[PDB]
Design a protein around this nucleic acid. Structure first.
Ligand SMILES: [Zn+2]
Ligand SMILES: [Zn+2]
Lengths: 114, 115
DNA sequence: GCTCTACGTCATCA
DNA sequence: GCTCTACGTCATCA
């Protein structure tokens, strides 16, 4: 039987990570490894990884899970991205965690000025 | 016979002004009154009247005539607006021709500021 | 720790 | 005198 790629034990995958993000990952393992499997909102992807609307709205570039906006179902739908995908793109984009942190430095300096 | 609203004489309206912009105005009268009937690109509307993409892209708000982009038919289509409509909406927005010149003063100063 | 876009410039590519 | 949007911030309203 096919096994979880993290633990190599469980055979029952997390429905969301499996069906939406195509990751063969069990629910316990998702919770133990949030550094890979945590689900990030659209707003968090902008803040933390400096991804833009053009990058995040590309359906060819990230898997996403949509849900009703928790503040109101009349507001625009919440979109959730898996950390490992977002992070890998942002690393190619800014040049690794080093690059990302430099970019974070650059912006904070920008903001200190204003 | 229905007559041109500027001259009150011609019976044959400018096809573009009549068909696209709904103005009962003859071609000669349009050439004589560019201050009303001149066709402005999308870009001129932004430059001259500070209208935004959201206003100009509103199909309920301006009549527009599209044409192939004259630089290349692979580029975005040219959009032409009629000055009377664009001007009338810009006067409501900025507070008449006076307010528009003010808004112009402001932005030229902003650009000077940045040097 | 929700999302979209206006506010406004401007280059670049299309 | 061509047009769309990224580049970026951020409030506001949705
Ligand atoms: Zn597992
Ligand atoms: Zn006439």
């Amino acid at each position: 039987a096919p096994k979880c790629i993290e633990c190599h034990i469980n055979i029952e995958m997390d429905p969301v990570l499996h069906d939406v993000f195509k990751l063969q990952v069990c629910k316990q393992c998702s919770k133990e490894h949030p550094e890979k499997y945590a689900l990030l909102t659209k707003t968090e992807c902008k803040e933390d990884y400096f991804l833009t609307d053009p990058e995040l709205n590309d359906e060819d570039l990230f898997h996403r899970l949509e849900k009703p906006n928790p503040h109101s179902g009349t507001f625009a739908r919440m979109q959730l991205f898996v950390r490992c995908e977002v992070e890998a793109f942002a690393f190619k984009k800014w040049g690794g965690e080093e690059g990302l942190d430099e970019e974070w430095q650059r912006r904070e300096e920008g903001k200190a000025h204003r």
